[PDB]
Amino acid sequence: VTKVTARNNKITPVELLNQKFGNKINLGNFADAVFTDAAFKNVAGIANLPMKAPVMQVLMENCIVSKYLKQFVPDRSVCFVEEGQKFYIVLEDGQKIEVPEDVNKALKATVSDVKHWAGYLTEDGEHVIDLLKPAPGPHFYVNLLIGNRLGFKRTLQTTPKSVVDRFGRGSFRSHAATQVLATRFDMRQEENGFPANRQFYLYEDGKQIFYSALIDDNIVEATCKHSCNRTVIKYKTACNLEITRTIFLVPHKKGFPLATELQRIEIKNASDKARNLSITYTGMFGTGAVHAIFEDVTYTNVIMQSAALYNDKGEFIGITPDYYPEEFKQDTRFVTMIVRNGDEKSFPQSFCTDYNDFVGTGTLEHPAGGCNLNNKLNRKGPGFFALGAPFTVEPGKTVIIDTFTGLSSSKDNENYSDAVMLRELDNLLRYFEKSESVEETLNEIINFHENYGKYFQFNTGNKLFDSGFNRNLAFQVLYQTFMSRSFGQTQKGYREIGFREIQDLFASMYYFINIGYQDFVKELLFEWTANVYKMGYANHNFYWVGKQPGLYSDDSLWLLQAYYRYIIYTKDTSVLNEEVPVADGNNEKRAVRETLKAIIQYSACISVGDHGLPLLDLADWNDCLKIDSNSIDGATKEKLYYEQLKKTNGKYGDRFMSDYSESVMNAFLLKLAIDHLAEIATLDNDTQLAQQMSELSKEVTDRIQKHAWKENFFARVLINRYKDGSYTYLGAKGDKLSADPNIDGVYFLNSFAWSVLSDVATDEQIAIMVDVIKKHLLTPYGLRLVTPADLNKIANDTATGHYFFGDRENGAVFKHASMMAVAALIKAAKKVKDNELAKEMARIAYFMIDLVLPYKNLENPFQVAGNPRICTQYINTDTGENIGPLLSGTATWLNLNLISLAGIEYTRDGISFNPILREEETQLNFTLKAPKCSYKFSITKPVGFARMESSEYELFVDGQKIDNTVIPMYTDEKEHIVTLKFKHH
């Protein structure tokens, strides 16, 4: 027997359709096709579609069309062609046959609005999704909801988060990986949570008429609306019922439970007769013993039971899971329902807590015992629940059903017990007693996010771009500030906060400072600073406490960038005097200034190699550069360094002798950190530190230029353990480590990116590196991280590849690294003397940006997939598809790059204004917010590339012409108009 893989099947159905029917009928620009048999010999297809879409998949789903096609498809190839609003089927012999009337109607209905099969974005950037259409990808129809713990304790560690799909499916978490609603770990990326979560059934006379997660013949229209931090789903039934589901997380208030999700269900009777209905709201609680799910499911079942909840009047209101083991009694979950007939209030009348009893002989979509619940409290788990309530809807009236699903934790209370949960639940239910309270809370959420996004507002003509930046990107930046990489559609494991993830704060910081939350930014800075050891290295991860001390060599250097941004923007140098605990513990404290100095010393004097550059250690920002198999962490290095000092009679600050490899990216980060510290010291009137840092910066730049530049590129790694000279560096021409015979040497994008960002590379080096990037690192789908490399030569135990070509490490386009490179290109284009080179870099930067903007994913959704409102991780260079997860560094650097392209850069003297517009653009207007003032920026130019470095321009501030391009930060609480006009040449 023989085997044929998916990738080895060269001929696609569309190619075969083009071959068979290309020269006989007009196939248009896009068409769809499907093989009619397992031999891949004949195809059935449809021609002239507005865009690529799985039209044949939907057509085969139709009984009439399938029946009609069955008389040709098995043996003959057919194609559908529309002429004069009339459909014909074309065979391989040229026969054109008019299809019957019913087939014609079915085809006309199907091909209608094909361009909207993936939904569309409103003027506010909200995604409107049809529930009956195929999904471009597992992440396309996903929305992320977050809580609000601002003004409370451990904001990062206690903010609730949730993921909601087009049908309301997903999971809900409270802190770390604590599950309120069960998460599903299965084979499919689409299944994030237990299927029963957030779903409900409506019964009329004991017979099911509605299920919230099934679109049947009784539903005439069903749509979902994904917006910022809330989801709305609307159904219309053939029996004239209007159903509206609104799902959102409750912002925290004093006395509330730690996590609470609210779903409001509005049932409106659009008929002229009163209807007596019943609602059954189902769900599944998440288990406390997550590990046991994979080890002992019986253990998870037998350690918990169900309990009923009653109010002060003795009426059943909800269910909770009760755990025996003490470790699982520190969190208490709850679900409650309330029914409002305008002003009358009623509570659920029945409940079920057994999945087997609920489903019975039916299925989850058609449960056999879904209407009449047995009211039996299960003695075991899992925490499945269903609450049933009857009600009556008068003609033209509406009934509301509010469901609160939440969790109380000991992480926010002392002497925690179930009594605490009961008290917090009582407070929550008292707060949401009136019907209008829910609407007020929703409006509060909406207004909070609208106001948060007002730090920077684009006002161009492109409504989609304006909405995507002003609302969607700002919300994603806030989300990645609170969570880092912990939760998502396919991010379901337990993850701690990585030290370098402070990169997120690079952007969100500004927003937070402009809604009066500067103290929150300071607290985040101090929390990160608390994870730096006395020597200078930092913990790699931390949620409640740090771990993995000094495992990676780059972690500590991002803190300098964060502090520089904060201090430059706010001018608040007092943070340097704050006493923060050191990661070593023992109740020792150190000033922030000393911690920054220690970081610089560790990365510049102690942990350095033979060439004076920082050591690679286990790895750096790039986790695949595991060159040294005998690497050591921070603590081992510290003890060995002290032993060396004692033995050699050295002094603290001397180099730690070894033959380990050196990282050039770390060298660039160190140079940038030293420059930032020099600027901070200058702002702090510390002249001695400023001049010392300036001299150290010059020394480090000289070392990098002398040892890292290799006549074609900046090397990525310097190798020191091969005395014979077989291998000495990696990441430039002549390194002898290229796995591609057509490429002489390996090239890393980060090399060029952070050589430009650190301000080490010169103009000639920038030009050479840009040429190399265009030659090798630039692909039709963007800038790839690195060219193929054969690391087995220098690291024998490097293992082999894990991914097909184009996926992740096998030549994919990582959007985070590409965005960093785009930042470097933007920075270079502002100051490079050569105008042609600047124009080329600007073109490359805009080309790369166009591949990352989420909204543009809706241009060809069924080819690029991704998500039209949330940034994804990487692009598959084999197919061009955008692949999750939804949380990554793409959003932060995209926001920074878009703001910098507008010309905004914060320096010691104010805003350094230097916009770089698109060639086709002729106008750019935006509004900027600042503590104590605001700006209205307008830029005008003719068609073509224009920049302040090599173009004639006029700049006015408040109507007064000015010469210097640095606009001061005003403090008069007024709005200042800035106008730039590029003269036509």
Nearer to a second copy, 77 or 287 (CB): 287
Binds 376: which of Cl ion, a second copy, none (CB < 5-8 Å by kind): a second copy
Stretch that binds a second copy, among 112-120, 181-189, 731-739, 780-788 (CB under 8 A): 181-189
Q: Using CB under 8 A, which residues numbered 208 to 247 contact a second copy?
A: 214-215
Q: Using CB under 5 A, which residues numbered 730 to 789 contact Cl ion?
A: 748, 750
Q: Using CB under 5 A, which residues numbered 487 to 546 contact Cl ion?
A: 488-491
DSSP state for residue 577 in the 8-state scheme: G
Q: Using CB under 8 A, which residues numbered 786 to 825 contact a second copy?
A: 800-804, 807-808
Binds 365: which of a second copy, Cl ion, none (CB < 5-8 Å by kind): a second copy
The single residue listed with the structure tokens 């935006």 is 926
Could you tell me the two tokens for 117? 């099969």
Per the document, the length of the chain is: 985
The mark string for 601-640 relative to Cl ion (x by CB under 5 A, - otherwise) is: ---------------------x------------------
Helix (H, G, I), strand (E, B) or coil at 535: coil
Q: Using CB under 5 A, which residues numbered 469 to 488 contact Cl ion?
A: 488
Q: Using CB under 8 A, which residues numbered 366 to 385 contact a second copy?
A: 368-369, 371-372, 374-379, 381-382, 384
Q: Given candidates 19, 26, 29, 66, which one binds a second copy under the rule CB under 8 A? A: 66
Residue nearest Cl ion, CB atom distance: 488
- Judge whether 749 and 773 are in contact, CB under 8 Å: yes
- Judge whether 704 and 754 are in contact, CB under 8 Å: no
**Residues binding Cl ion: number (CB under 5 A):** 10
Q: Using CB under 5 A, which residues numbered 885 to 904 contact Cl ion?
A: 885-886
The mark string for 117-136 relative to a second copy (x by CB under 8 A, - otherwise) is: ---------------x-xx-
Shortest CA distance to 160 belongs to which of 512, 152, 205, 374?
A: 152
Measured distance CA(939)–CA(230) in Å, rounded: 35
- Judge whether 858 and 929 are in contact, CB under 8 Å: no
The contacts of residue 45 (CB under 8 Å, 6+ apart) are 13, 14, 17, 21, 31, 32, 33, 34, 56, 77, 78, 79, 80
Q: Using CB under 8 A, which residues numbered 285 to 304 contact a second copy?
A: 287, 293-303
Binds 488: which of Cl ion, a second copy, none (CB < 5-8 Å by kind): Cl ion
Binds 640: which of a second copy, Cl ion, none (CB < 5-8 Å by kind): none
Sheet holding 539-542, edge to edge: 497-498, 539-542, 546-549
**Residues binding a second copy: number (CB under 8 A):** 116
- Judge whether 261 and 402 are in contact, CB under 8 Å: no
Minimum separation from the CB atom of position 57 to a second copy (A):
6
Nearer to a second copy, 194 or 542 (CB): 194
CA angle 437, 125, 922 (to 5 degrees): 140
Measured distance CA(93)–CA(621) in Å, rounded: 61
Nearer to a second copy, 67 or 397 (CB): 67
Minimum separation from the CB atom of position 96 to Cl ion (A):
48
- Judge whether 592 and 673 are in contact, CB under 8 Å: no
**Residue 25 binds a second copy, judged by CB under 8 A:** no
- Judge whether 143 and 179 are in contact, CB under 8 Å: no
Stretch that binds a second copy, among 28-36, 151-159, 515-523, 671-679 (CB under 8 A): 28-36
Quickly list H helices, 168-258. none
Measured distance CA(739)–CA(791) in Å, rounded: 8
Strand stretches in 532-615, DSSP E: 539-542, 546-549, 579-581, 589-591
**Residue 112 binds a second copy, judged by CB under 8 A:** no
Nearer to Cl ion, 488 or 868 (CB): 488
Minimum separation from the CB atom of position 754 to Cl ion (A):
9
- Judge whether 603 and 614 are in contact, CB under 8 Å: yes
Measured distance CA(914)–CA(371) in Å, rounded: 66
Please state at what angle helix 835-850 crosses helix 815-831, rounded to 10 degrees: 150
Q: Using CB under 8 A, which residues numbered 461 to 520 contact a second copy?
A: 490, 492-493
Q: Per-residue DSSP letters for 587-638?
A: T-EEEHHHHHHHHHHIIIIISB-TTSSBB-BS--SSTT----TT---HHHHH
**Residue 450 binds a second copy, judged by CB under 8 A:** no
Shortest CA distance to 754 belongs to which of 713, 722, 791?
A: 713
Nearer to a second copy, 317 or 794 (CB): 317
Binds 942: which of Cl ion, a second copy, none (CB < 5-8 Å by kind): none
Binds 622: which of Cl ion, a second copy, none (CB < 5-8 Å by kind): Cl ion
Nearer to Cl ion, 782 or 884 (CB): 884
**Residue 742 binds a second copy, judged by CB under 8 A:** no
Minimum separation from the CB atom of position 39 to a second copy (A):
6
Question: In the complex, which residues of this chain contact Cl ion (CB under 5 A)?
Answer: 488-491, 622, 748, 750, 884-886
